Design an enzyme around this catalytic site. Structure first.
Site, short mmCIF file in Angstrom:
data_model
loop_
_atom_site.label_atom_id
_atom_site.label_comp_id
_atom_site.label_asym_id
_atom_site.label_seq_id
_atom_site.Cartn_x
_atom_site.Cartn_y
_atom_site.Cartn_z
N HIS A 63 -14.15 -3.97 2.91
CA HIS A 63 -14.33 -5.36 2.47
C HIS A 63 -15.40 -6.00 3.35
CE1 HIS A 63 -11.19 -5.66 -0.53
NE2 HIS A 63 -10.19 -5.43 0.30
N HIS A 74 -1.80 1.29 -3.11
CA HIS A 74 -1.77 0.70 -4.47
C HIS A 74 -3.01 1.22 -5.21
CE1 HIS A 74 -4.80 -2.41 -3.76
NE2 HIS A 74 -4.11 -2.83 -2.68
N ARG A 94 -10.64 0.85 3.95
CA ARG A 94 -9.65 1.67 3.20
C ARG A 94 -10.10 3.11 2.96
NH1 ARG A 94 -7.80 -2.55 4.38
NH2 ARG A 94 -7.22 -4.28 2.98
N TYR A 110 0.86 -1.21 0.00
CA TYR A 110 0.00 0.00 0.00
C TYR A 110 0.89 1.25 0.00
CZ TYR A 110 -3.50 -3.31 1.50
OH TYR A 110 -4.34 -4.38 1.56
N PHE A 162 -15.68 -4.55 -2.36
CA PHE A 162 -15.93 -3.51 -1.43
C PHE A 162 -17.36 -2.99 -1.42
CE2 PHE A 162 -11.40 -2.78 -2.58
CZ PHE A 162 -10.83 -2.68 -1.30
N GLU A 197 -5.61 3.32 -2.81
CA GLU A 197 -6.19 2.86 -1.55
C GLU A 197 -5.11 2.62 -0.51
OE1 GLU A 197 -7.15 -1.55 -1.10
OE2 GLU A 197 -7.82 -1.16 -3.22
#
Length: 104
Positions: free
Chosen positions: A92, A40, A77, A38, A100, A58
């Protein structure tokens, strides 16, 4: 009240801004952390109607209030763009197959 609700996690806009600041700095510096690297790119397969422009990145926001530093990212996120604008907060939690839902 919580500015964002991700499952049963409650985030204030200040938790969100702090998380977004840390992920954007790493993006600006071209650096990553964590086994999933991350921040990413976020492809937006969900088709969220974000009002700021793509590309999107994110970065994990942690229910503990700590800034993500590698280690488990959790399910939540922050999503931002190259203009350091917030696109949204997604999770998630309550989704399957790495998809998501949006934190309300």
């Amino acid at each position: 009240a919580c500015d964002y609700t991700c499952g049963s996690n409650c985030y204030s806009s200040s938790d969100v801004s702090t998380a977004q600041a840390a992920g954007y700095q790493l993006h600006e510096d071209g650096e990553t952390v964590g086994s999933n690297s991350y921040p990413h790119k976020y492809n937006n397969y969900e088709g969220f109607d974000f009002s700021v422009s793509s590309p999107y990145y994110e970065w994990p926001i942690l229910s503990s209030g700590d800034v993500y530093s590698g280690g488990s990212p959790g399910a939540d996120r922050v999503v931002f763009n190259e203009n350091n604008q917030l696109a949204g907060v997604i999770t998630h939690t309550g989704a399957s197959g790495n998809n998501f839902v949006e934190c309300t």
